Amino acid sequence: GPLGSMEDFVRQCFNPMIVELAEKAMKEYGEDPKIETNKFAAICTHLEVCFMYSDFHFIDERGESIIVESGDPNALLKHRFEIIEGRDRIMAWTVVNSICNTTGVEKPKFLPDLYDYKENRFIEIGVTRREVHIYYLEKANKIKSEKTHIHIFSFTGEEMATKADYTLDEESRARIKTRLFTIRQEMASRSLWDSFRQSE
Ligand SMILES: N#Cc1cccc(-c2c[nH]c(=O)c(O)c2)c1
Ligand SMILES: [Mn+2]
Ligand SMILES: [Mn+2]
């Protein structure tokens, strides 16, 4: 088949808000989306996974964790997750320090991706084109002292999470895996996958 551009794929297959946040992140990282295009797609994918991980999850009027897949959650419901990824540096740390000084949860040394108000911990989300256990170790070694819970997804459906604690129900994680499969399949149809996979 014809070779598409990764740029075209990103703009056509991710929500514009995700794309914009990804562009802003790369600018902050000092990287040009039009040159580091595999990176651009990876950043969009990881941001989307962070959003999907948080989607629909609330803590109810009684303080238990519930899933509300409707458009209207009751106004007394609080979001279960704080989302850290996607914020600029200053705002991301502002949100972290707030959570920390508020919950007593110690300050992480690197920005994590989410905070889970049910499990009372930060989460680092990983998305990898390689085997989950290798990527897991890489994340953990960067994290060192671990308060922060790690959850890794691969494009082929494997997962690895700290202490075999996967946080979410199967259906939620299935949504994420289905989305990753869709991304891979679409990339493949445009002949972008092999390089995207190899570039990690
Ligand atoms: N530059 C760059 C780049 C490329 C691919 C992925 C990421 C990334 C960002 N945040 C994360 O939390 C993460 O787990 C990965 C960053
Ligand atoms: Mn980031
Ligand atoms: Mn992050």
Ligand SMILES: [Mn+2]
């Ligand atoms: Mn992450």
